[PDB]
Amino acid sequence: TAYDVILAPVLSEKAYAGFAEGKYTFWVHPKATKTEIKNAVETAFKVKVVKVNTLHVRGKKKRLGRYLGKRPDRKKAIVQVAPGQKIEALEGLI
Amino acid sequence: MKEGIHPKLVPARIICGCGNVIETYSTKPEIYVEVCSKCHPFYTGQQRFVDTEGRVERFQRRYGDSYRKGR
Amino acid sequence: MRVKMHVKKGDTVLVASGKYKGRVGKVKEVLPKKYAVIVEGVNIVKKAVRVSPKYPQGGFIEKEAPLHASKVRPICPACGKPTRVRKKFLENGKKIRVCAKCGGALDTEE
Amino acid sequence: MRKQLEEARKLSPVELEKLVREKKRELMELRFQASIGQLSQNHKIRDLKRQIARLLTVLNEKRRQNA
RNA sequence: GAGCCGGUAGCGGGCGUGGAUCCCUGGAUGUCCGAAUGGGGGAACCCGGCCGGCGGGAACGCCGGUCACCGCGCUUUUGCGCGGGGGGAACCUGGGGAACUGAAACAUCUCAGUACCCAGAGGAGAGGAAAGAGAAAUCGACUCCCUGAGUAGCGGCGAGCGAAAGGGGACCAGCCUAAACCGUCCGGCUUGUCCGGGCGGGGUCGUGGGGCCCUCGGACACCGAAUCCCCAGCCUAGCCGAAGCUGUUGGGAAGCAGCGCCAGAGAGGGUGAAAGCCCCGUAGGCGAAAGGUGGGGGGAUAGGUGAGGGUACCCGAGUACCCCGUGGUUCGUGGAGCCAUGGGGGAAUCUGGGCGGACCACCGCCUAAGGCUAAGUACUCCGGGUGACCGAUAGCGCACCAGUACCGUGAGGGAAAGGUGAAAAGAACCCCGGGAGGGGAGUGAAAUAGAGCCUGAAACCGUGGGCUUACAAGCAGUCACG
RNA sequence: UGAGUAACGAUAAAGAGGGUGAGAAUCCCUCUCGCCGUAAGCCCAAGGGUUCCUACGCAAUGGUCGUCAGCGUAGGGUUAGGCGGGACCUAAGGUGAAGCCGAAAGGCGUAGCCGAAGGGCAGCCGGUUAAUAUUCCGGCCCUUCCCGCAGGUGCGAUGGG
16 A cells, blocks of 8 residues: 555666666556655665666567467666765676 | 326327328229328426416317316 | 375384384375385386396385375374364464374474 | 464554564565575565565554445 | 466466365446536547645646536425436337239239337336126126137128137136315415315225215225245255276277176266266266345235215316317228217216117116226247257357458458367487478377368379371261271 | 479579587678668657567477577567647547427537647757667756745736726
8 A cells, every 4th residue: 555665677788787877777666656656665775876767668569388378568667866876786696 | 208298198109101092992092102201299387376387189188277276 | 195195204003914013204205105114125127228227127116005004103003083172372283192192292302 | 473463463554554664674684685695585575575565554454444 | 176377388487285276146346438517528538626645835737525417305595315228139019101912004002000210118018997898677897818710790892801799718806086065274365154285084996975864883805016035046166976897809998708797867078089887076866055036825914995874965087079181900981880089169076978770769788088907828139948940051140269351431241261199209319401391310199180180072284104196177986807 | 182393472682701509591690782862861750669678598470591689488588848749729530517309219509618739838960879869967057836035016807998
């Protein structure tokens, strides 16, 4: 209920450059909305976010020996940090 | 029911066999019709303590506004 | 052939077998019966994978399809389950009783 | 465990929320170890999902049975 | 009752008799779309007003709650309070309503008030206490089953269509109102005493009330949901449930054999092949709950009901009745009723009026223009039992990730496809090969039961064997013979 | 069966050397050759929706071949105050208080509301990725909004122009 938690981190070859300069990449709840990505980030971590970018994306093709379905609708979200400071766990991990 | 009356309520069906007769004088009538037909009423009205209408129908208008003038 | 069965894991003689010899039930299954009972190894033959120590052919896989490994071995040999009462204040205990009346209770034994 | 239900009964409102909101952040933990810890963590995501549902439930009850 | 984390196994981790999962009722959240309804819209998306809530203030974004329209009484000022709103396999009622065909053509006719369209209600619907039936001074709400009777009958009297009473039979109740009389109550108009609105009685169930005056009277009849209360039945979670073992051939028995036992329980299904006594919360029989349903029972509340006379009279429905125009009933203008009505004229209060008699005299039967109603019967979406019913090109279009694939702008059409074995023990390991694929090796009672895998048929295709064939005739063949 | 016959989807034609691989006229490099060139080139829209891309793979599908592929398995992939579209507008048509209708369902219609490749409103050049750009990065460049501060105004509806 109306919780702060709506996200889950991306592991693109892209994303790691963003970590090289603090442009992070969370998957999010596919109905988040810029500003809420902001406050969800500030609250769930503590930084001053500047710019949030969002990015719908979706699977298709996927088969199961005989039958045919699709990977669930999905919503990527770039985000940044202003000083260049903070969130480090994410870049240290990988 | 928008071609009914209001003090009463009226909209009937019909067939209309035409054709001859000459029964009680000679042979017997011709007939030849299966044609369904409308057969219907009317509109008009008056005034409240100022401001009205009515719609109603014919005989039940002589009766009609009799009644409603009778308030 | 539903929630309904028999054995806890217990001690069990077989009948329809080609073995008939018996000892304790080690695993059972509800919906399938099959309940393996430390008897009748076979093979599968395991590949050559490192999950295996590398050498092939396992010696042991187990399913006694019958729900006819005749139940329970009290002092009397084979016997069917019956019922219970309660005796002891607030109980259940649908104990083995036919001929011999061993519990199957988890006290000193199973 | 029924413990959980004890203290869940015991708190009255927004206290219970600072609780549950924390425990959700512990979900953010476990979801970010999607990459690695995974193991003993399995029970963590599942137990946490569950019992957070519990605290929400009892919160729903107190919200009802008060006003 | 103690194993579990659905179909589904594997990676993996964990939780259980200090009652897990599963099951049953309830409670909770319940995204968005849909009657959709805060407004828009190309359904699943958009855009907001309003009080509130967090985040960096506001901005901007969320989080919660409210905002549709109509009729209903309302508060005739406050939309406050009610209700509708839609959706259903079949059944029903009403509003509409057809042709092919049938008549050996074809309109009258029939197919046919059918199919179908739409409105409406429900678990049933309508129907329903007589202005009847019709011949007996008889019947007595209605519906449903039988028979009446394929008769009475209607018809280009051609096709064909086709009752009703009457008798058995099921289930079996009747009620509430306008009678304007008064009271009284408001409220009107206008004043007094006419009207509008309530309450009593009366507000008739069989033909009667009111007013008047005398005798009444001082309870069993219980709801047409009365109202409640349990046995209240089901929802599943129901539960016990009786009785046998050895040998024996075989991969296996529960066969065969030696005995022996239960039976208010020898129905059936399962387990390597053929069990009453192994299993089968399975029959026999019994046994079940705090919660969600109502008859049979019982009370009760019991709303409510209930004379005898006399007297002039006062009052039951405003449109009946006649006429032209049609429909129903067996009726198609027929001597034609009757009920229903679209116009047109327009009445009376039981010394009244409708009906059998087209009409009239007589004789009866009834008492209209307000309304409501259990049961008997019809149908299956959902359930359970039964098959001289299929048993996979049969059965439903579908025995299994079909109203899907797929075809179609679209409404719509609409398929294939089941079965390895007792258990996988679905094949390690070697050899050849790019791997596929095979040969051994293996498990199996059998792999010629090995993965489109039981049985495996014909067409068809091939390999080897036997006779036969290059100067020939004829689809086929057949008889004679060498 | 016709039949291993017709056909292989334009008469813009290729040839070689090297590599990859078990196998390559077909795939990848190299050098020759030829056709298009106002199109067979580069963009935007409608449309299709996942390939695109990368690493794997070659049973099937590519009317042949394939060690390749716009095919299979898995993995990664599109970022906007100013680009378009909705929080702005209206045309036709639609829908719709009022109202009129209609055996029923529904028909029509004012005001109003919806409706666009028309109106209007604020960016252009460069860089970088295996795969996105005027969005990410740099460079300059502007808009509407909220709050504070100043100076000033009779401000003021979207009603008349």
